[PDB]
Design a protein around this ligand. Structure first.
Ligand SMILES: O=c1[nH]cnc2c(Sc3ccccc3OCP(=O)(O)O)c[nH]c12
Ligand SMILES: O=c1[nH]cnc2c(Sc3ccccc3OCP(=O)(O)O)c[nH]c12
Ligand SMILES: O=c1[nH]cnc2c(Sc3ccccc3OCP(=O)(O)O)c[nH]c12
Lengths: 261, 262, 268
């Protein structure tokens, strides 16, 4: 049962961290690990694999670690790594970390990801606030009887708080696709026609599950590339990884400052 | 085998209703269930749970009802309560009511549903004829070697007969999505771009199955809410049940008067 | 009844071994998959040195179309040894995508560097005629599926090699190109769905190819895609044609396109 597995996970988290309740959770995606160094000093770090119901992250740069971090009056559950629908897991396992974080007390989820830019004026390494999403997976993490409203799924209030730390932050609609193949240029033109600004392979189900469980969501993409058929700056793979790591390191400090309110 | 479970269901329907043949079937959506109280004078009520093929092996709670209702010269099979794709069951169970009804002689399927309104002229509590659909589920109820042309899937002839009962009935394109989450405002703007007037969580597979089985389809949406991000108010299942309950007597009357014209 | 879930790479290796043994050819550098309406193309490719039933190869689900569909032919074309798969299986038949893309993976394991993937399609774009062959410039995968599993990534830029389209147009410079929308099927589209597909940039609509292209690119093969327009899509206006006119136009185009592919492959 998803709710009971979430309650068991939250019990182990409380016991292993010695913290009764974490009021904020952060899921770090691909390219986001460098944010850890700037978020704060962890009081506990443990493998996700030792938590009930957690399929260990396997994607390159997903540590598969949970960090407990004090940030002002807040106790922040940091999930360094997530699992993806393209790994073949039932969506109940994909959204279990978010349900476990809610059961551990998290009222606000920061969901981070890597994304393709669908606009030629986005830059590799640019952080982009998620204004909304397009679920283009033909799936839901919810079952019969769970009829959840996704108006303001990405809290306007949280984007406003982020812009108090960096008022220049861009925003965009994130298209969640199944993957794991990348898009054809014709698919990228279609996504622009459907009103998407960003493309990736996570987040939409985690957002739906977070809203169904009564949590507010702040979504942040790191643009790792311009999407198929959009020509962008000639960068080496080292320049792409370096630009991403520098933004992820800066965004850790920004998230710490925003969470601290 | 879907066709054989349909045939066995039709045999039991004939035996328990004492009616050899039903020429019309009505599927009542969430938001149309209360209309069963106001749709003619039912002579027989059968539990779907006692009919072959109706309940998925891992079905949740109690199955629905089937009623036999005389409406004009017609004997109507009314399916009160249905299986949705969002419950996770094979689409054979979503479309079994349509296939069982066809095997019992139904040449016309009235498929009803609740919908979010996208087109500006469509109001909460308005019945809307379905002109066409967008299947946005990436699924089909048909298996290999079952082909069907979906040109005029929603019989123009039946929409014209409905308009003899109420000549001001609007019509719109219905987008069938998986659900059960409601849409983001961004997804609603996308659906407007793709030409949807209505959004919901049923019907598209039942329509495909009906056409494949040789039945004509009338689709009727009740607008239970404006689509996400139009008012800015959140959406709830309570709105669908509330709009259905309030409209039940009107919608029952409409379905009776339209079916009488078939 | 149970699906054994064989490992794709090993099933492809074993299939390529049986293909080498039964054809007496160690390597096939080109593969051709002939879709619906494409059987007339077979004779113009050349004289086959081996013909065998697909069903006798490991991992091959037999195509449902019988006769000369469901065959593998080994055909010499210039300096090349060409693996011709007459018929395919479809996602609508309900099989796991590993079976849908297994023929392409088996062909790659037998040495195929280039895949020619042909299909039937409905025409959306105003200029397209029933019977017209159309080069695939790009695709829209509208199935919400992938034939790739966790950790397998592929860039689908130029999935349909511009080089191979240019070689096809050297053999017949009037060949049109268009974007193929791959749908699950097996129902055909409503007119409203077809107006949607036009908005999303599709010129052609069918029930195959997209997963085979993804699997081909992931395995390192170049792809040439060709649609035969068998019908105008739902709601698309055109001259009324009889069933006989439609079928005859297709068969004559398939014959010509067989000769064109023989000439193009000789220049690969
Ligand atoms: O162009 C692009 N198309 C589609 N997806 C992307 C991504 S995200 C991505 C891609 C492959 C694997 C994992 C990914 O994300 C993991 P997560 O951060 O969401 O946990 C970047 N660029 C593109
Ligand atoms: O705005 C909307 N978006 C998407 N679906 C809807 C529905 S339908 C619906 C909603 C909740 C639960 C079940 C529903 O369908 C059952 P049925 O009537 O088709 O049997 C109304 N409004 C919207
Ligand atoms: O209008 C159309 N809509 C959608 N699909 C089509 C097809 S393809 C097709 C249809 C039924 C069965 C199989 C099919 O594909 C065979 P293949 O050549 O890809 O192996 C033609 N016309 C339309």
């Amino acid at each position: 049962d998803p709710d009971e597995l979430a309650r068991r996970a939250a019990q182990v988290i409380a016991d292993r961290t010695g913290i009764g309740e974490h009021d904020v959770a952060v899921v770090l995606g691909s390219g986001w690990l460098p944010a850890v160094a700037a978020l704060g000093s962890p009081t506990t770090v443990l493998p996700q694999a030792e938590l009930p119901g957690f399929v260990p992250p396997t994607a390159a740069g997903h540590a598969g670690e949970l960090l407990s971090v004090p940030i002002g009056a807040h106790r922040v559950l940091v999930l360094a790594g997530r699992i993806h629908a393209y790994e073949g897991h039932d969506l109940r396992y994909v959204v279990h970390p978010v349900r476990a974080a809610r059961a551990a007390g998290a009222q606000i989820m920061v969901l981070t990801n890597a994304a393709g830019g669908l606009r030629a004026d986005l830059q590799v390494g640019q952080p982009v606030l998620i204004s909304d999403h397009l679920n283009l997976t033909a799936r839901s993490p919810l079952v019969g009887g769970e009829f959840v409203d996704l108006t303001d799924a990405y809290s306007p209030r949280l984007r406003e708080l982020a812009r108090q730390s960096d008022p220049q932050l861009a925003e965009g609609v994130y298209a969640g696709l199944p993957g794991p193949h990348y898009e054809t240029p014709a698919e990228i033109r279609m996504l622009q026609t459907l009103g998407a600004d960003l493309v990736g392979m996570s987040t939409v189900h985690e957002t739906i599950a977070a809203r169904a469980a009564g949590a507010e969501v702040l979504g942040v993409s790191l643009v790792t590339n311009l999407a198929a058929g959009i020509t962008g700056e000639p960068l080496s793979h080292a320049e792409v990884l370096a630009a991403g790591a520098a933004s992820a390191t800066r965004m850790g400090a920004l998230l710490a400052d925003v969470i601290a309110r």
